[PDB]
Design a protein around this ligand. Structure first.
Ligand code: NA
Ligand code: NA
Ligand code: NA
Length: 172
């Protein structure tokens, strides 16, 4: 299955007219015995993975730079056997007022394994959301990691999003 995977995120900064656009890639890990329970831990710009298996070589609180301004790399194959699910998403900071993906120009994410593209998205499906999951990694019976597209919108701020981003969706 997948051995290592990365997530890169781009977005445009805000007009001189407005407070910064602060977006974060956020991931959570889930125990084999509770794939949809509480996160085992949360990974984002200000919180490293405790096991060293996830890194961010860059991150941004503004989107000022050009291209992919934030990235998170996962060495899935190096995760404890007791972790069997990972979910990664993107959250918009809400401290300058209610702000969705539709409010922020050229928001984009790419999920890849090296040179194999897994997902590219502009968050069009979740225009009204303050935060969104984009991808799920889960282990096989044989223990190999698999990817699934998991683009789903949420209405929470970044901290609340992390608590709920792994919960079982509603069937439909
Ligand atoms: Na950020
Ligand atoms: Na940018
Ligand atoms: Na957008």
């Amino acid at each position: 299955g997948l051995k290592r995977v990365d997530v890169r995120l781009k977005w445009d900064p805000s007009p001189w007219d407005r407070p910064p656009h602060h977006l974060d890639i956020i991931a959570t890990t889930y125990a084999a015995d509770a794939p949809h329970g509480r996160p085992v831990y949360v990974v984002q710009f200000d919180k490293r993975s405790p096991d060293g298996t996830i890194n961010m070589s860059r991150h941004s609180r503004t989107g000022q730079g050009f291209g992919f301004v934030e990235e998170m790399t996962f060495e899935l194959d190096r995760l404890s056997p007791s972790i069997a699910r990972v979910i990664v998403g993107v959250a918009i900071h809400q401290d300058n007022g209610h702000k969705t993906f539709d409010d922020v120009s050229n928001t984009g994410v790419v999920v890849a394994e090296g040179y194999r593209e897994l997902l590219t998205d502009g968050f069009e499906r979740v225009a009204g959301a303050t935060a969104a999951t984009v991808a799920e990694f889960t282990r096989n019976a044989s223990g190999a990691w698999e990817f699934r597209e998991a683009v789903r919108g949420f209405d929470s701020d970044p901290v609340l999003f992390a608590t709920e981003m792994g919960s079982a969706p509603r069937p439909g």
